[PDB]
Paper text:
Human short coiled coil protein (SCOC) is an effector of the Golgi resident GTPase Arl1 and was recently identified as a positive regulator of autophagy in a genome-wide siRNA screen. SCOC interacts with fasciculation and elongation protein zeta 1 ([name]). Their N-termini are variable, whereas the approx. 70 residues long coiled coil domain is highly conserved, also among different species, highlighting its functional importance.
We determined the crystal structure of the coiled coil domain of human SCOC isoform 1 at 2.7 Å resolution. The structure was solved by single wavelength anomalous diffraction (SAD) phasing using selenomethionine labeled crystals of the L105M SCOC mutant. The final model comprises residues 86-147. SCOC is a parallel left-handed coiled coil homodimer. The structure contains eight heptad repeats and has a length of about 80 Å. The asymmetric unit contains three SCOC molecules. The coiled coil pitch of dimer AB (residues 97-143) is 129 Å and 151 Å for dimer CC’ as calculated with the program TWISTER. Remarkably, half of the a heptad positions at the core of the coiled coil are occupied by polar and charged residues. Instead, we explain this plasticity with the enrichment of polar and charged residues at the a/d-heptad positions.
Author numbering:
A (entry chain A): 86 to 146
B (entry chain B): 88 to 147
The structure:
Protein backbone atom coordinates (compact mmCIF):
# COMPACT_ATOMS: atom_id res chain seq x y z
CA UNK A 1 0.00 0.00 0.00
CA UNK A 2 2.49 2.59 1.25
CA UNK A 3 5.20 -0.05 0.76
CA UNK A 4 4.51 -0.03 -2.98
CA UNK A 5 4.83 3.75 -3.27
CA UNK A 6 8.25 3.53 -1.58
CA UNK A 7 9.44 0.90 -4.05
CA UNK A 8 8.31 3.12 -6.91
CA UNK A 9 9.88 6.18 -5.26
CA UNK A 10 13.20 4.40 -4.83
CA UNK A 11 13.01 3.20 -8.45
CA UNK A 12 12.44 6.71 -9.80
CA UNK A 13 15.28 8.02 -7.63
CA UNK A 14 17.66 5.56 -9.23
CA UNK A 15 16.55 6.60 -12.70
CA UNK A 16 16.85 10.27 -11.82
CA UNK A 17 20.47 9.83 -10.69
CA UNK A 18 21.15 8.04 -13.95
CA UNK A 19 19.79 10.98 -15.98
CA UNK A 20 22.07 13.27 -13.95
CA UNK A 21 25.20 11.23 -14.44
CA UNK A 22 24.45 10.69 -18.12
CA UNK A 23 24.01 14.39 -18.71
CA UNK A 24 27.27 15.16 -16.89
CA UNK A 25 29.22 12.45 -18.73
CA UNK A 26 27.78 13.88 -21.92
CA UNK A 27 28.89 17.41 -21.04
CA UNK A 28 32.50 16.49 -20.18
CA UNK A 29 32.62 14.71 -23.51
CA UNK A 30 31.14 17.54 -25.61
CA UNK A 31 33.67 19.96 -24.17
CA UNK A 32 36.59 17.67 -25.04
CA UNK A 33 35.45 17.38 -28.66
CA UNK A 34 37.04 20.43 -30.29
CA UNK A 35 40.43 19.75 -28.66
CA UNK A 36 40.35 16.28 -30.22
CA UNK A 37 39.45 17.39 -33.76
CA UNK A 38 42.04 20.16 -33.47
CA UNK A 39 44.78 17.68 -32.54
CA UNK A 40 43.70 15.48 -35.44
CA UNK A 41 44.22 18.30 -37.93
CA UNK A 42 47.66 19.09 -36.48
CA UNK A 43 48.78 15.47 -36.73
CA UNK A 44 47.54 15.25 -40.32
CA UNK A 45 49.56 18.35 -41.18
CA UNK A 46 52.74 17.08 -39.53
CA UNK A 47 52.28 13.72 -41.24
CA UNK A 48 51.93 15.32 -44.66
CA UNK A 49 54.94 17.61 -44.18
CA UNK A 50 57.15 14.79 -42.85
CA UNK A 51 56.23 12.43 -45.72
CA UNK A 52 56.91 15.18 -48.24
CA UNK A 53 60.35 15.89 -46.76
CA UNK A 54 61.27 12.23 -46.82
CA UNK A 55 60.26 12.20 -50.48
CA UNK A 56 62.80 14.98 -51.14
CA UNK A 57 65.66 13.51 -49.12
CA UNK A 58 65.28 10.14 -50.84
CA UNK A 59 65.16 11.62 -54.35
CA UNK A 60 68.43 13.41 -53.64
CA UNK A 61 70.13 9.97 -53.68
CA UNK B 1 -6.64 5.71 -14.01
CA UNK B 2 -4.41 7.29 -11.37
CA UNK B 3 -2.04 4.33 -11.79
CA UNK B 4 -1.95 5.17 -15.51
CA UNK B 5 -0.76 8.70 -14.67
CA UNK B 6 2.16 7.51 -12.55
CA UNK B 7 3.23 5.09 -15.27
CA UNK B 8 3.27 7.86 -17.88
CA UNK B 9 5.57 9.86 -15.59
CA UNK B 10 7.87 6.90 -15.21
CA UNK B 11 7.82 6.37 -18.97
CA UNK B 12 8.87 9.93 -19.71
CA UNK B 13 11.67 9.34 -17.21
CA UNK B 14 12.77 6.03 -18.70
CA UNK B 15 12.66 7.60 -22.14
CA UNK B 16 15.02 10.32 -20.95
CA UNK B 17 17.54 7.73 -19.80
CA UNK B 18 17.28 5.86 -23.12
CA UNK B 19 17.71 8.97 -25.23
CA UNK B 20 20.68 10.10 -23.16
CA UNK B 21 22.28 6.67 -23.53
CA UNK B 22 21.70 6.77 -27.28
CA UNK B 23 23.20 10.25 -27.71
CA UNK B 24 26.21 9.37 -25.53
CA UNK B 25 26.83 6.04 -27.23
CA UNK B 26 26.90 7.77 -30.62
CA UNK B 27 29.08 10.69 -29.55
CA UNK B 28 31.61 8.56 -27.69
CA UNK B 29 31.84 6.24 -30.71
CA UNK B 30 32.62 9.23 -32.94
CA UNK B 31 35.22 10.66 -30.57
CA UNK B 32 36.85 7.23 -30.06
CA UNK B 33 37.24 6.89 -33.83
CA UNK B 34 39.07 10.22 -33.94
CA UNK B 35 41.16 9.41 -30.83
CA UNK B 36 42.13 6.06 -32.36
CA UNK B 37 43.26 7.82 -35.54
CA UNK B 38 45.23 10.36 -33.48
CA UNK B 39 47.14 7.52 -31.80
CA UNK B 40 47.85 5.98 -35.19
CA UNK B 41 49.15 9.33 -36.50
CA UNK B 42 51.40 10.00 -33.47
CA UNK B 43 52.82 6.54 -33.89
CA UNK B 44 53.35 7.19 -37.62
CA UNK B 45 54.90 10.63 -37.19
CA UNK B 46 57.36 9.19 -34.73
CA UNK B 47 58.45 6.64 -37.36
CA UNK B 48 58.84 9.29 -40.03
CA UNK B 49 60.66 11.61 -37.59
CA UNK B 50 63.07 8.91 -36.51
CA UNK B 51 63.79 8.07 -40.15
CA UNK B 52 64.54 11.68 -41.02
CA UNK B 53 66.93 12.12 -38.10
CA UNK B 54 68.75 8.99 -39.38
CA UNK B 55 69.17 9.95 -42.99
CA UNK B 56 70.41 13.32 -41.80
CA UNK B 57 72.60 11.81 -39.04
CA UNK B 58 74.28 9.69 -41.72
CA UNK B 59 75.24 12.57 -44.03
CA UNK B 60 76.58 14.62 -41.09
Amino acid sequence: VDAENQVELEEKTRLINQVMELQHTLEDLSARVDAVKEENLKLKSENQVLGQYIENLMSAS
